[PDB]
Amino acid sequence: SMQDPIADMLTRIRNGQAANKAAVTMPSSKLKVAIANVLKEEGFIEDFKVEGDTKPELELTLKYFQGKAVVESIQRVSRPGLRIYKRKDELPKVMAGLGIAVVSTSKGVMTDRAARQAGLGGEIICYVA
Amino acid sequence: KIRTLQGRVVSDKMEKSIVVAIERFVKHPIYGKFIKRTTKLHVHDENNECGIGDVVEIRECRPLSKTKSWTLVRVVEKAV
C-alpha cells in the first residue's frame, strides 16, 4: 500500500521532474516537511506550501535549467523491508561528494556534509544525486 | 547496576520455577535484517506468583538445577 510514503514522495518528484510538470501536490506529513525543507535549502527545489489541516496536502514547486531535469535521479536507500544505518565515519557520499545524502539524526534532518560538524550517524533516507 | 534482563512468561506449570522467553533484535551478518530471536530461560519463581503472559524482570543467580540459572526480581504487569 502506502507503507513507504517517502518512497511514494520520491516517486512523485521523479515523475514530474522528467515529464516537464510545473508543480505537484501530495499528502503531507511531519517527515515529508523535514525532507523537502532541506531540499529547498540545497538548491534542488524552489518552494513548498502546506494546505489543509484535516487532510494535510504538501505542494512542491519544480525546478529546471533550460527545461532540463535538475534532479536527474534520486535513490531510496533504506526501506521498511531492510533498514540501513551508518555511523559518523561510515556516512557514504553521492557522486564522490557532489550529490548529498539525506540522513536524519537526533539533531534533526541534515546532510552528510552537515553531519561532519555534528558528528553523528543514523538512518539514510535518500541519495539526492 | 547489576546485570538484569526483562521478558515475558510462556510457561508456569511446574512448581517453584517458570519459563521466561527473551526476544532480541539481531542484525543479520549477511543481509542486515533485524530478526526477532527467542531465548527461552528457566527462572526460579518464589511463591509461584507469575502467571501466563506477564511482563517480568529477572536477574542472574547461581545454577539451582540442571537447567536453571536465573531468578526473580519483581513482576511488572500481571494478568492483563
Binding site: 523491508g81 531492510l82 | 543479520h28 549477511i30 543481509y31 542486515g32 535484517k33 530478526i35
Partner: peptide, 14 residues
C-alpha cells in the same frame, strides 16, 4: 530478489 525470502533459505551454492 527479496531479502526477506533469503532469511528463510539462502542462495544455494552449487
Amino acid at each position: 530478489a527479496t531479502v526477506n525470502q533469503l532469511v528463510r533459505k539462502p542462495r544455494a551454492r552449487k
